[PDB]
């Protein structure tokens, strides 16, 4: 419609993810959760609650044939994760920012293989200065028995990050699957994964468990719950709309004005190169913006 | 000449290069020399010398209207090594190569201010590729760490006016080649000619002249290795001034900047040493950047 199209979208996303960052470090902090699929789960069960609540007050669509082809999505999401903080378990968060800045070129260059596009060197300039960016901010920061496992589930992450932004976008696209109708099914089928995912690799232990996630934490995985929603249906409008390069180029853009705040608004130390890594990554935006801008009057 | 065009030059001004490399480290070894601009005025006076006898047996040409436009060209060059000696003083060869690559990129943007090009988006891509492999370099090497902000601070200063002059160098040169059809054993000829006044001149102002203490440590050994490395220097002062001309004042510094890699992975190949697999990760990054810059280039031809 109206607004559900081009830049807002960006926007929008953009906002949700700022208050998402704030509710998970201001409002329910102290979120070192030993159960994280569980409260991924709650997260997903707070959007499809809010989905039905809102449909039977105004949307979306229930299915089987479109369920068993959405399946692999919801079960790539989940695995993304799954490798995501299996990666972050013996990788340094700047170095983890290296391989999913680098995950953009092959979801790039992947989406040529699925779409039919081309990568233009102006597009291919603005991630080699986001790779750039991630580097310089590695750079600017403080055994083969320790090597190996971060990395081959650091490879493993990037190659699931980059089917499930390539394979949901086209299935949307396949499906005409609006936005309401994409959040919808990213939850739902996410649901018993999910589960299955948390009873594989989480303890279960009754009351060293009943201890610890007890009313505080049901009310706060509910709030953080409440900040996921705008979030899981802006990630589907953003891919949608634009592309999956785009959504993971915004995705990378959005850490930065949270990193400034960070030096504006709190008195901490900081190096130059961490700085300049800030300014590197707007200049990667910048040129992306151009390129995009490039590619309309060019085709 | 006819096979006075194209890669042919690239290639010449490699092996020129290679050559050079190999007589500093092996032919005229432990020339961690105290008078650097008297062994380049050495240089320049065998580069002569070897112009007059071949021009007498056969080239060349001597002015003065030429001479007057060539004397900033020359005084470039020798700021060019100064600038550049004192900003290795204080700062790391890894961090030297990051500045030195970047400089690649306001040749190229220069060039548009001086002969009206435009950096396509493809040369701008392998330009950061450059930039990329130079930090991935640095970021995979603990030679960095050279022994308070009283001990380390000039070293940006002298690193950002050799920025200015390599680049002002290259795109003065290169400009006054095509102006005055220079060809090549010109641009050689007036570039080592005008700078034996100026190597002098430095020298008097930057080295210590102390009579019996220089003596002993300039002699006959010395004297002989001068020669030496001036007869290696003999190619590739040719062939940079022919590379500049042919190709472009970006080709040159990217061609320059290219040189290093095979020299590295040398090291890699031929000697028994440590290392990491970033400085490795490095080499290849750098050859996807002048693989790139060579489709860049190729695309041009066939887009104007
Ligand atoms: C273990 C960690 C490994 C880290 C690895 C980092 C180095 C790779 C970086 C970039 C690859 C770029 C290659 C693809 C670009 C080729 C040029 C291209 O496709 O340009 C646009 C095209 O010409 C339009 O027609
Ligand atoms: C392929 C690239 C990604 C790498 C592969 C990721 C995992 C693949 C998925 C399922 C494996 C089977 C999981 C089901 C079995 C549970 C494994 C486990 O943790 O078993 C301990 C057991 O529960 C103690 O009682
Ligand atoms: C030490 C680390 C602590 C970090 C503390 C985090 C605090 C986060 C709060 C506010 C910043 C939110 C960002 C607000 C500005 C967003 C601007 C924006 O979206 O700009 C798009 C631009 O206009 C397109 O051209
Ligand atoms: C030591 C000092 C500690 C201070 C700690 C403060 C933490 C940050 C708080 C607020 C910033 C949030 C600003 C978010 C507003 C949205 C950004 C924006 O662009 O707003 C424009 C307009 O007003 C609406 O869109
Ligand atoms: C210790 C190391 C510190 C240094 C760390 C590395 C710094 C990299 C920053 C900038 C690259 C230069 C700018 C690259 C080009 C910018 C965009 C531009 O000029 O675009 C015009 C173009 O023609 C449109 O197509």
């Known amino acids: 419609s109206v607004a559900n199209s081009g830049p807002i979208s960006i926007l929008s996303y953009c906002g949700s993810s ?8 201001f409002v329910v902090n102290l979120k070192d959760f030993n159960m994280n699929f569980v409260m991924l789960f709650v997260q997903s069960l707070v959007c499809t609650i809010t989905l039905i609540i809102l449909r039977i007050l105004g949307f979306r669509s229930l299915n089987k044939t479109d369920a068993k082809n ?7 999401l989940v695995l993304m994760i799954y490798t995501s ?3 972050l378990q013996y990788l340094a968060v700047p170095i983890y920012t290296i391989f999913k800045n680098l995950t953009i070129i092959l ?28 580097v310089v901010a590695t750079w600017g920061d403080q055994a083969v028995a320790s090597f190996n496992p971060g990395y081959f589930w650091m490879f493993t992450n990037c190659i699931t990050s980059a089917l499930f932004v390539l394979i949901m976008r086209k299935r949307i696209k396949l499906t005409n699957f609006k ?25 279960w232990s009754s009351v060293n468990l009943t201890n610890n996630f007890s009313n505080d ?55 130059f190169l961490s700085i300049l890594s800030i300014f590197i990554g707007f200049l990667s935006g910048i ?10 009057q060019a085709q």
């Open 18 to 25: 700022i208050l998402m960052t704030v509710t998970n470090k």
């Open 70 to 76: 959405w399946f692999p999505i919801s079960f790539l």
């Open 85 to 87: 903080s299996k990666a």
């Open 107 to 134: 979801i790039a260059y992947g989406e040529v293989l699925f779409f039919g596009g081309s990568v233009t060197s102006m597009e291919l300039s603005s991630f080699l200065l986001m790779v750039l960016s991630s």
């Open 179 to 203: 936005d309401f109708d994409t959040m919808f099914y990213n939850n739902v089928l996410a649901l018993p994964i999910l589960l299955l995912f948390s009873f594989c690799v989480e303890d």
């Open 217 to 271: 934490s049901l009310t706060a995985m509910i709030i953080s719950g409440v900040a996921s929603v705008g979030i899981s249906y802006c990630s589907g409008w953003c891919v949608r709309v634009t592309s999956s390069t785009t959504y993971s180029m915004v995705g990378a853009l959005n850490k930065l004005p949270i990193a400034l705040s960070g030096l504006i608004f709190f008195d901490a130390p900081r190096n």
């Open 287 to 296: 040129i992306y913006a151009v390129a995009k801008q490039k590619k309309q």
